Design an enzyme around this catalytic site. Structure first.
Site, mmCIF file in Angstrom:
data_model
loop_
_atom_site.group_PDB
_atom_site.id
_atom_site.type_symbol
_atom_site.label_atom_id
_atom_site.label_comp_id
_atom_site.label_asym_id
_atom_site.label_seq_id
_atom_site.Cartn_x
_atom_site.Cartn_y
_atom_site.Cartn_z
ATOM 1 N N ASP B 25 0.774 -1.238 0.000
ATOM 2 C CA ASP B 25 0.000 0.000 0.000
ATOM 3 C C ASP B 25 0.801 1.282 0.000
ATOM 4 O O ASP B 25 1.251 1.756 1.027
ATOM 5 C CB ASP B 25 -0.864 -0.003 1.253
ATOM 6 C CG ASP B 25 -2.129 0.759 1.036
ATOM 7 O OD1 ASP B 25 -2.069 1.930 0.678
ATOM 8 O OD2 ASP B 25 -3.183 0.174 1.216
ATOM 9 N N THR B 26 0.916 1.894 -1.174
ATOM 10 C CA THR B 26 1.685 3.137 -1.243
ATOM 11 C C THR B 26 1.074 4.312 -0.491
ATOM 12 O O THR B 26 1.731 5.222 -0.022
ATOM 13 C CB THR B 26 1.893 3.481 -2.718
ATOM 14 O OG1 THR B 26 0.638 3.582 -3.398
ATOM 15 C CG2 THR B 26 2.725 2.411 -3.413
ATOM 16 N N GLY B 27 -0.246 4.289 -0.386
ATOM 17 C CA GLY B 27 -0.839 5.439 0.285
ATOM 18 C C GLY B 27 -0.885 5.335 1.786
ATOM 19 O O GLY B 27 -1.432 6.171 2.473
HETATM 20 O O1 LIG Z 1 -12.283 2.300 -2.682
HETATM 21 C C1 LIG Z 1 -12.173 2.314 -1.466
HETATM 22 N N1 LIG Z 1 -13.000 1.617 -0.667
HETATM 23 C C2 LIG Z 1 -14.080 0.805 -1.216
HETATM 24 N N2 LIG Z 1 -15.195 0.434 -0.550
HETATM 25 C C3 LIG Z 1 -16.094 -0.245 -1.348
HETATM 26 C C4 LIG Z 1 -15.692 -0.427 -2.688
HETATM 27 S S1 LIG Z 1 -14.160 0.290 -2.823
HETATM 28 C C5 LIG Z 1 -11.148 3.128 -0.744
HETATM 29 C C6 LIG Z 1 -10.542 4.217 -1.407
HETATM 30 C C7 LIG Z 1 -9.548 4.966 -0.749
HETATM 31 C C8 LIG Z 1 -9.149 4.630 0.567
HETATM 32 C C9 LIG Z 1 -9.760 3.540 1.226
HETATM 33 C C10 LIG Z 1 -9.353 3.138 2.616
HETATM 34 N N3 LIG Z 1 -7.917 3.261 2.928
HETATM 35 C C11 LIG Z 1 -7.580 4.033 3.977
HETATM 36 O O2 LIG Z 1 -8.456 4.366 4.763
HETATM 37 N N4 LIG Z 1 -6.319 4.431 4.206
HETATM 38 C C12 LIG Z 1 -5.971 4.779 5.591
HETATM 39 C C13 LIG Z 1 -4.744 4.127 6.198
HETATM 40 C C14 LIG Z 1 -4.427 2.756 6.017
HETATM 41 C C15 LIG Z 1 -3.277 2.191 6.625
HETATM 42 C C16 LIG Z 1 -2.439 3.009 7.416
HETATM 43 C C17 LIG Z 1 -2.754 4.377 7.602
HETATM 44 C C18 LIG Z 1 -1.885 5.257 8.467
HETATM 45 O O3 LIG Z 1 -0.707 5.043 8.727
HETATM 46 N N5 LIG Z 1 -2.542 6.315 8.952
HETATM 47 C C19 LIG Z 1 -1.958 7.287 9.868
HETATM 48 N N6 LIG Z 1 -2.639 8.171 10.601
HETATM 49 C C20 LIG Z 1 -1.821 8.920 11.421
HETATM 50 C C21 LIG Z 1 -0.447 8.638 11.345
HETATM 51 S S2 LIG Z 1 -0.326 7.409 10.208
HETATM 52 C C22 LIG Z 1 -3.906 4.928 6.992
HETATM 53 C C23 LIG Z 1 -5.329 4.706 3.146
HETATM 54 C C24 LIG Z 1 -5.759 5.963 2.369
HETATM 55 C C25 LIG Z 1 -5.754 7.188 3.243
HETATM 56 C C26 LIG Z 1 -4.518 7.748 3.641
HETATM 57 C C27 LIG Z 1 -4.486 8.824 4.547
HETATM 58 C C28 LIG Z 1 -5.701 9.341 5.056
HETATM 59 C C29 LIG Z 1 -6.931 8.787 4.646
HETATM 60 C C30 LIG Z 1 -6.968 7.710 3.733
HETATM 61 C C31 LIG Z 1 -4.828 3.550 2.307
HETATM 62 O O4 LIG Z 1 -3.761 4.012 1.549
HETATM 63 C C32 LIG Z 1 -5.858 2.984 1.376
HETATM 64 O O5 LIG Z 1 -5.305 1.939 0.589
HETATM 65 C C33 LIG Z 1 -6.989 2.377 2.177
HETATM 66 C C34 LIG Z 1 -6.584 1.178 3.053
HETATM 67 C C35 LIG Z 1 -7.764 0.260 3.201
HETATM 68 C C36 LIG Z 1 -8.169 -0.506 2.083
HETATM 69 C C37 LIG Z 1 -9.304 -1.329 2.179
HETATM 70 C C38 LIG Z 1 -10.018 -1.380 3.398
HETATM 71 C C39 LIG Z 1 -9.605 -0.617 4.510
HETATM 72 C C40 LIG Z 1 -8.473 0.217 4.420
HETATM 73 C C41 LIG Z 1 -10.761 2.796 0.576
#
Ligand SMILES: O=C(Nc1nccs1)c1cccc(CN2C(=O)N(Cc3cccc(C(=O)Nc4nccs4)c3)[C@H](Cc3ccccc3)[C@H](O)[C@@H](O)[C@H]2Cc2ccccc2)c1
Lengths: 99, 99
Positions: B25-27
């Site tokens: 996961d790059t994001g």
């Molecule tokens: O299409 C999607 N969903 C669908 N539902 C039905 C059909 S398709 C969909 C699209 C985009 C994002 C996601 C949901 N999503 C996230 O919520 N995160 C938060 C994340 C994930 C992992 C770690 C962190 C992290 O380190 N966060 C931190 N916070 C503070 C310090 S670090 C954050 C980020 C994106 C993000 C980054 C920063 C802030 C907010 C978000 C990831 O990069 C995404 O791949 C993904 C991960 C994921 C994938 C599937 C199920 C659950 C979780 C889902």
């Protein structure tokens, strides 16, 4: 062009005459943008994330430019905190992951 | 190896003796795994994501073998829908996003 992941892989998009930056996100099935204004018709949709789920607007056949690459896709607009380009569009621009 | 994004980039990890699949996961800035038993010490942290904040527990120095490679780092364990390998570890395996 190749990016490393020491920092967030961020690019400029132009969508709807607006310039945005967005995160290229291999984990995201769908492209989700914060709230901004788009012309047209859209359907209500929900998607999940960690945390929970949000409710978004589903516009499709939207032209995006991401760096110099054009692509037409479905875009969801709503309360994500960062604009995310996901797999439905990273596939169109030709992105791969390499390790 | 090289992943096209037509499918979710899932990969096999081994952690704490156990065998899981996980999303590359790059994001995602950190790695967060679903609940599992890890030995040792941790502390509570909270992370954000789309649609909210989960509370997670942080273990530092966990060995993870990811595909075949070993990397050591902090892993957060918590109620994610899916095991996610984020940039903290992707940098250690040499992952690049490549368009
Ligand atoms: O299409 C999607 N969903 C669908 N539902 C039905 C059909 S398709 C969909 C699209 C985009 C994002 C996601 C949901 N999503 C996230 O919520 N995160 C938060 C994340 C994930 C992992 C770690 C962190 C992290 O380190 N966060 C931190 N916070 C503070 C310090 S670090 C954050 C980020 C994106 C993000 C980054 C920063 C802030 C907010 C978000 C990831 O990069 C995404 O791949 C993904 C991960 C994921 C994938 C599937 C199920 C659950 C979780 C889902």
């Amino acid at each position: 062009p190749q990016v490393t992941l020491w920092q967030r892989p961020l690019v400029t998009i132009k969508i709807g005459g607006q310039l945005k930056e967005a995160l290229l996100d291999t984990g995201a099935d769908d492209t989700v943008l914060e709230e901004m204004s788009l012309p047209g018709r859209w359907k209500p949709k929900m998607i999940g994330g960690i945390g929970g789920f949000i409710k978004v607007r589903q516009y499709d056949q939207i032209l995006i430019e991401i760096c110099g690459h054009k692509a037409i896709g479905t875009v969801l607009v709503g309360p994500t905190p960062v604009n995310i380009i996901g797999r439905n569009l990273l596939t169109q621009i030709g992105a791969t992951l390499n390790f």
